[PDB]
UniProtKB/Swiss-Prot annotation, chain A:
Signal peptide span: none
GO MF terms held by the record: RNA endonuclease activity
Gene name in the database record: Rnasek
E.C. number(s) listed in UniProt: 3.1.-.-
Name of the protein: Ribonuclease kappa
Residue ranges of the TM segments: 9-29, 61-81
Biological process annotations from GO: endosomal lumen acidification; proton transmembrane transport; receptor-mediated endocytosis; receptor-mediated endocytosis of virus by host cell
Compartmental location: Endomembrane system; Cytoplasmic vesicle, Clathrin-coated vesicle membrane
Species, as recorded: Mus musculus (Mouse)
Family: Belongs to the RNase K family.
Swiss-Prot record, chain B:
Entry's family note: Belongs to the synaptophysin/synaptobrevin family.
Residues in the Vesicular compartment per record: 33-90, 146-183
Species for this entry: Mus musculus
Domain statement: The calcium-binding activity is thought to be localized in the cytoplasmic tail of the protein.
Topology, Cytoplasmic side: 115-121
UniProt entry tagged with the keyword Magnesium: no
Entry membrane topology: Multi-pass membrane protein
Residues in MARVEL domain copies: 4-211
Domain of life, per lineage: Eukaryota
Descriptive protein name: Synaptophysin
One of the GO biological process terms: chemical synaptic transmission
Transmembrane spans: 9-32, 91-114, 122-145, 184-207
Primary localisation category: membrane
Curated annotation (Swiss-Prot), chain C:
Organism: Mus musculus
PANTHER family given in the database record: V-TYPE PROTON ATPASE SUBUNIT E 2, VACUOLAR ATP SYNTHASE SUBUNIT H
Keywords: Cytoplasmic vesicle, Glycoprotein, Hydrogen ion transport, Ion transport, Membrane, Synapse, Transmembrane, Transmembrane helix, Transport
Name this polypeptide is given: V-type proton ATPase subunit e 2
Subunit text: V-ATPase is a heteromultimeric enzyme made up of two complexes: the ATP-hydrolytic V1 complex and the proton translocation V0 complex. The V1 complex consists of three catalytic AB heterodimers that form a heterohexamer, three peripheral stalks each consisting of EG heterodimers, one central rotor including subunits D and F, and the regulatory subunits C and H. The proton translocation complex V0 consists of the proton transport subunit a, a ring of proteolipid subunits c9c'', rotary subunit d, subunits e and f, and the accessory subunits ATP6AP1/Ac45 and ATP6AP2/PRR.
Glycan attachment positions: N68
Disulfide bonds: none
UniProtKB/Swiss-Prot annotation, chains D, F:
Family, similarity comment: Belongs to the V-ATPase proteolipid subunit family.
Main function: Proton-conducting pore forming subunit of the V0 complex of vacuolar(H+)-ATPase (V-ATPase), a multisubunit enzyme composed of a peripheral complex (V1) that hydrolyzes ATP and a membrane integral complex (V0) that translocates protons. V-ATPase is responsible for acidifying and maintaining the pH of intracellular compartments and in some cell types, is targeted to the plasma membrane, where it is responsible for acidifying the extracellular environment.
Keyword Repeat carried by entry: no
GO terms for MF: P-type proton-exporting transporter activity; proton-transporting ATPase activity, rotational mechanism; ubiquitin protein ligase binding
Protein name: V-type proton ATPase 16 kDa proteolipid subunit c
Gene Ontology biological process: lysosomal lumen acidification; positive regulation of Wnt signaling pathway; synaptic vesicle lumen acidification; vacuolar acidification
One cellular-component annotation, GO: proton-transporting V-type ATPase complex
Post-translational modification (record): Ubiquitinated by RNF182, leading to its degradation via the ubiquitin-proteasome pathway.
Cytoplasmic side: 29-50, 110-126
Site (Essential for proton translocation) location in chain: E134
Membrane-crossing segments per the record: 6-28, 51-71, 88-109, 127-147
Topological domain ranges for the Lumenal compartment: 72-87, 148-150
Pfam annotation, one family: ATP-synt_C
Gene name for this UniProt entry: Atp6v0c
Length: 86, 211, 79, 150, 246, 150
C-alpha cells in the first residue's frame, strides 16, 4: 500500500549500516576513550592541567553517539513498518 | 522436579556457578593504593607525603606519579612500568562470557530439562562447552598467576626508587611509608584455582552423566 | 617490543602445513584438481605478500614523524 | 612594514570571482534559450520541462556572487601579502570553474531541449547530466571557503 | 594450456593488491552474498536492467574479490581510513625519551613538528599483525608507505611475470619442436632472469642488511642499476653494494 | 630571511588544481551529452545505459578537489621557496594531466555512444578504452603526493 518496499529497501540497508557503525563508534570512543591514533579531534584549547579533562570530554563526545544511533533505531523500525504495508 | 535437584549434577553445577560468580565479580572491580615519602638534602623541598593508585586489571604501565626533583624546586613524572592487562583482561572477559553460559546452562537445567533428556543431545553440547571452558580456565589461571607474580615484582619500593634518576645522589632518602596490600590478589587467585578444580570435577561428572 | 623469530615461525609453519595437507584430505571427484590449484596458488601468493610486508618493517632506517600534542597525549594514554 | 601594492592581488580576486562567473551564466541562459526557441513550436507546453538550464545558470551566478561578497567583506588597509595572495587565488579559481560549468550547462541544455522535443522520455534523463555539471560549481565554492580562513 | 585455474585465483588476488581496504571488503562481500542467496528467486524472475544481468553473471568474481579485499585490507591496516590498533605499539615511553636527552621540548613544539631521529638505543620492534598502526597519524607516513608500495609492486610483478613466461616450455616439449626450445625459450628465460632477478636479489639485500646506524653512506638502488646499464664506473660518490660487485 | 614573494607561487598552485582539471571534466560531460541526443531518438531504451561516460568525466573533478584540499592545509606564512615551488609543480602537473584525460574521455565517449547506437556488441569495447583515459588522470595525481614530501 503506502511506501512500497521497492523504494525503501535501500533505506533499510542504510539504516542497518548506520546503527551498527554508530554503535561501534560510540563503543570505541567510550570504552577505549578514543585513543588519539583513532581520533584527532577533541573539544578544548587549554589542556595544560591534566588527564581528567581529556577523558571526561571523550566520554561527553561518545555520549553523543546516542540520539545519533537512536535516530535510526527508530527510522529502521518505521521503514520496516512501511515495507510491511502491502 | 526435585529428583534432578537431589541429583549431584545440578547441585555441583549451582555451587560452581556461585563460586565463579563470586570470583570474577570480586576480581573485576579492584582498586588500591600505596604510600611513599621522598626526602632530600634540603628539608624545604622534601615531600613527606606521596600516594600512588592502582586498580584492575592491573595495567601497571599506565600507572605513574609525580615526585620532586629536589633541584631548584623541580619535579618530574616517574612512570611505573609493567604491562599485565593481557592475562587479567583475558581471564575476566572470558569468565564473564562463561558466566553468561552459566546462566544459560542453569536455564537449560531448570526449564528445558525435557529437551535435555530428548535424545541426550544437549548433554553432548554441554560437555563440549564445559571442556573448552575448563581448558581456558586452566590456561587463564596459569597466566593470571604469572601476571600477578609480575605485579609482586612491580610493587617493590626499591625498584621504583632505583628507577627515579635523582635518587643516586647523596641525601635523597627516598623511603617507603605503606606498601601495597597483596591480600586481595592471592585471595582472588585462590578462588580462581578452586573453581578451576571444581569445574574439572564437573567436567568428569558430566562425562559420566552423558553415558 | 615484538620478537621476530616467533611470528615468522608460526606463520610459515601454519601456511606451509595448510598448503601441504590440503589436497590429500580433499576428497576425490570431478573437480578436485581445480580446487587444489586455487589452494596452492592462494597459499603461495598470500605468504609471499605477508613476507614482503613484514620484511619491509624489519630494520627501519628512519623513525616516524609525530606532532607535539600527539606526544603529550600518548605520554599518558599508554606506555 | 608591508608595501601598499599588497592590496593588488587581493581585490583582483574580489573582482575575478564575480567576472568570470557571470560569463558562465551568460552562456548557460543564452544558448539554452536559443534551444527553447526551437522547442516552443512543435510542443509549446514543455517550457516547464525545459526551464532547467536557466535555473542552473542562475545558481552558478549566485555561487559567484557569494564568494565575491565574502572575499570582499574581508578587506582592510593593512592587509598582509599572504592574505592578498590567498584571496586572489580563491577568486580566480572559483571564477574560471564557474566559467567552465556555464559552458557545459549551456551546451548540454541546448542539446537536451530539442532532444526532449523530439523524444519525450529523454526529459528525465536529461536532468541527470545537468546535475553533474552543477556539481562542478559546488566544487569551486568549496575551495574558496577552504581558502577564506586557512 | 587453459588459463582458467590460474586466473580464477590470481584475479581476486590482484584486485586485492589494488583494493587494500577492509570495510569496503565487508561491503562488497555483503553485496555479493545478497546477490548469491537469491539465486533461485532471481533466475525464476523477469529482469530488465542490463547492469543487473552482467553483475549477476559476475557474482562469482565479485564475491571472491570481496573476500580477498577483506584480508588485504586487514594487512593494509586501513579500514575506513583508520588503523585497527591492537595496541602493540612499542615506540615511545616517556623516561626512555628523557634518557635520550629530550625533556620539555614541546614548549617550542607547540608550533613545530619535531621529527624524532630513530634509534636512541631502546626502541624498535616489527609487528606480526601486518603494518604497525602508529603510521596512521604520522605526518611522514607518505614516504614510507610509498617506498613500501614501490617495492611491493615491482616484486609482485616480476614474480607474476616469471609465472607467466615459465609455462611455454611445457607446450614446446608437448608439440615436439626441438628447434623452438633448445634455441628458443632458453635464451628468453636466461635473459629475463639475469636482468631482473638481479634487481630482486639486490632489493632484498638492501632491505635486510643495511642497519639504521649506517643511514648515511647507504646506497640508492636505481643509481646502481643505471650505472650497470651505462657501464660507467665512478670511483667515488656511491659505494659498492657488496664485495665482488664488479 | 625569506622574501615576501615566496607565498605567491604556492598559492597559485592550488588555483591550478581547481581550474585546469575541472575544465577538462567540463568538456567531457558536454560532448557526451551530444552523443546521447544522437542516440536518444532511435534506441530509446539505452538512455540510462549511457550513464557511464558522464560519471567517468566527473571523477576527474574529484581528483582535483582532493589535491586542492591538501595544498590548502600545508600553506603557512613562513614558507621557503623550496616548498613553494614543490607545490606549484604538483598543482601544474595534476591540472594538466586532468585536462588531457578530460579531452580523451570526451572524444572516446562520443565515439562510444555513436558506436553502440548501431552495434550492441561494441559496448564492452568502448568501456575498455574509457578506462585507459581515466587512469591518465591518476598518474598526474601521483606526483602530487610525491611532491608533498620531497
Amino acid at each position: 500500500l503506502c511506501c512500497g518496499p521497492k523504494l525503501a529497501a535501500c533505506g533499510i540497508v542504510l539504516s542497518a549500516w548506520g546503527v551498527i557503525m554508530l554503535i561501534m563508534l560510540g563503543i570505541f570512543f567510550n570504552v577505549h576513550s578514543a585513543v588519539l591514533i583513532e581520533d584527532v579531534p577533541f573539544t578544548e584549547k587549554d589542556f595544560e592541567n591534566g588527564p581528567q579533562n581529556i577523558y571526561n570530554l571523550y566520554e561527553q563526545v561518545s555520549y553523543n553517539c546516542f540520539i545519533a544511533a537512536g535516530l535510526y533505531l527508530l527510522l529502521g523500525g518505521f521503514s520496516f513498518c512501511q515495507v510491511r504495508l502491502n | 522436579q526435585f529428583r534432578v535437584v537431589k541429583e549431584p549434577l545440578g547441585f555441583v553445577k549451582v555451587l560452581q556457578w556461585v563460586f565463579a560468580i563470586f570470583a570474577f565479580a570480586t576480581c573485576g572491580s579492584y582498586t588500591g593504593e600505596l604510600r611513599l615519602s621522598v626526602e632530600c638534602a634540603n628539608k624545604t623541598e622534601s615531600a613527606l607525603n606521596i600516594e600512588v593508585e592502582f586498580e584492575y586489571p592491573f595495567r601497571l604501565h599506565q600507572v605513574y606519579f609525580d615526585a620532586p626533583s629536589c633541584v631548584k624546586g623541580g619535579t618530574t613524572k616517574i612512570f611505573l612500568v609493567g604491562d599485565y592487562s593481557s592475562s587479567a583482561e583475558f581471564f575476566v572477559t572470558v569468565a564473564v562470557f562463561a558466566f553468561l553460559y552459566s546462566m544459560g546452562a542453569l536455564a537449560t537445567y531448570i526449564f528445558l530439562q525435557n529437551k535435555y533428556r530428548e535424545n541426550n543431545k544437549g548433554p553432548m553440547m554441554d560437555f563440549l562447552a564445559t571442556a573448552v571452558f575448563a581448558f581456558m580456565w586452566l590456561v587463564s589461571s596459569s597466566a593470571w598467576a604469572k601476571g600477578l607474580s609480575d605485579v609482586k615484582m612491580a610493587t617493590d619500593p626499591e625498584n621504583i626508587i632505583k628507577e627515579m634518576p635523582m635518587c643516586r645522589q647523596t641525601g635523597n632518602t627516598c623511603k617507603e611509608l605503606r606498601d601495597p596490600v597483596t591480600s586481595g590478589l592471592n585471595t582472588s587467585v585462590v578462588f580462581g584455582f578452586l573453581n578451576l578444580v571444581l569445574w574439572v570435577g564437573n567436567l568428569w561428572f558430566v562425562f559420566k552423566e552423558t553415558g | 617490543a615484538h620478537s621476530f623469530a616467533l611470528p615468522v615461525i608460526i606463520f610459515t609453519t601454519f601456511w606451509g602445513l595448510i598448503g601441504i595437507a590440503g589436497p590429500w584430505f580433499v576428497p576425490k571427484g570431478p573437480n578436485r584438481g581445480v580446487i587444489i590449484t586455487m589452494l596452492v596458488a592462494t597459499a603461495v601468493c598470500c605468504y609471499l605478500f605477508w613476507l614482503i610486508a613484514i620484511l619491509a618493517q624489519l630494520n627501519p632506517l628512519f623513525g616516524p614523524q609525530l606532532k607535539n600534542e600527539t606526544i603529550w597525549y600518548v605520554r599518558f594514554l599508554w606506555e | 612594514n608591508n608595501p601598499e601594492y599588497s592590496s593588488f592581488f587581493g581585490v583582483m580576486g574580489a573582482s575575478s570571482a564575480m567576472v568570470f562567473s557571470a560569463m558562465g551564466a551568460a552562456y548557460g541562459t543564452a544558448k539554452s534559450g536559443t534551444g527553447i526557441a526551437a522547442m516552443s513550436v512543435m510542443r509549446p507546453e514543455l517550457i516547464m520541462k525545459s526551464i532547467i538550464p536557466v535555473v542552473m545558470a542562475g545558481i552558478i551566478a549566485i555561487y559567484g556572487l557569494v564568494v565575491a561578497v565574502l572575499i570582499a567583506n574581508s578587506l582592510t588597509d593593512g592587509i598582509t601579502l599572504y592574505r592578498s595572495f590567498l584571496q586572489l587565488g580563491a577568486g580566480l579559481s572559483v571564477g574560471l570553474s564557474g566559467l567552465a560549468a556555464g559552458f557545459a550547462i549551456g551546451i548540454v541544455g541546448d542539446a537536451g531541449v530539442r532532444g526532449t522535443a523530439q523524444q519525450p522520455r529523454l526529459f528525465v534523463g536529461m536532468i541527470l547530466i545537468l546535475i553533474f555539471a552543477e556539481v562542478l560549481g559546488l566544487y569551486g565554492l568549496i575551495v574558496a571557503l577552504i581558502l577564506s580562513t586557512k | 594450456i587453459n588459463p582458467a585455474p590460474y586466473t580464477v585465483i590470481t584475479f581476486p588476488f590482484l584486485f586485492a593488491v589494488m583494493f587494500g581496504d577492509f570495510g569496503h571488503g565487508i561491503l562488497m562481500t555483503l553485496f555479493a552474498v545478497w546477490m548469491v542467496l537469491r539465486e533461485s528467486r532471481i533466475l525464476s524472475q523477469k529482469h530488465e536492467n542490463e547492469m543487473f544481468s552482467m553483475v549477476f553473471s559476475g557474482r562469482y568474481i565479485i564475491l571472491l574479490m570481496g573476500l580477498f579485499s577483506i584480508y588485504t585490507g586487514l594487512i593494509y591496516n586501513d579500514c575506513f581510513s583508520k588503523s585497527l590498533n591492537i595496541f602493540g605499539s612499542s615506540w615511545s615511553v616517556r623516561p626512555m625519551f628523557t634518557q635520550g636527552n629530550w625533556t620539555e621540548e614541546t614548549l617550542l613544539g607547540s608550533s613545530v613538528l619535531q621529527l624524532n631521529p630513530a634509534i636512541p638505543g631502546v626502541f624498535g620492534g616489527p609487528y606480526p599483525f601486518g603494518i604497525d598502526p602508529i603510521w596512521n597519524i604520522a605526518t611522514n607516513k607518505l614516504t614510507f608507505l610509498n617506498s613500501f608500495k614501490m617495492k611491493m609492486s615491482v616484486i609482485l610483478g616480476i614474480i607474476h611475470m616469471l609465472f607467466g613466461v615459465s609455462l611455454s616450455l611445457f607446450n614446446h616439449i608437448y608439440f615436439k619442436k626441438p628447434l623452438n626450445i633448445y634455441f628458443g625459450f632458453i635464451p628468453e628465460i636466461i635473459f629475463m632472469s639475469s636482468l631482473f632477478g638481479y634487481l630482486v636479489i639486490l632489493i632484498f639485500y638492501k632491505w635486510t642488511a643495511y642497519d639504521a646506524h649506517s643511514s648515511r653512506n647507504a646506497p640508492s638502488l636505481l643509481i646502481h642499476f643505471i650505472n650497470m646499464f651505462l657501464f660507467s664506473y665512478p670511483e667515488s660518490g656511491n659505494a659498492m653494494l657488496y664485495s665482488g660487485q664488479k
